[PDB]
Amino acid sequence: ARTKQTARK
């Protein structure tokens, strides 16, 4: 699956 890490915790 597409996953991402975002800046906001």
Next chain:
Amino acid sequence: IDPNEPTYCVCHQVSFGDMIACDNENCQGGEWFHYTCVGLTPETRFKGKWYCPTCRLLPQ
């Protein structure tokens, strides 16, 4: 939080943390999902198939 920042997920909140995309391009369940809202372990990848809680119950 800028009011223009899109919201996502079951929880209807902005992006944060690790998120996973529903495999359905036409997802009406929130498109992207915070790992914690959908039972996934933070800071892990998810290489295989995944539908959100709505799309995984849709009839095929």
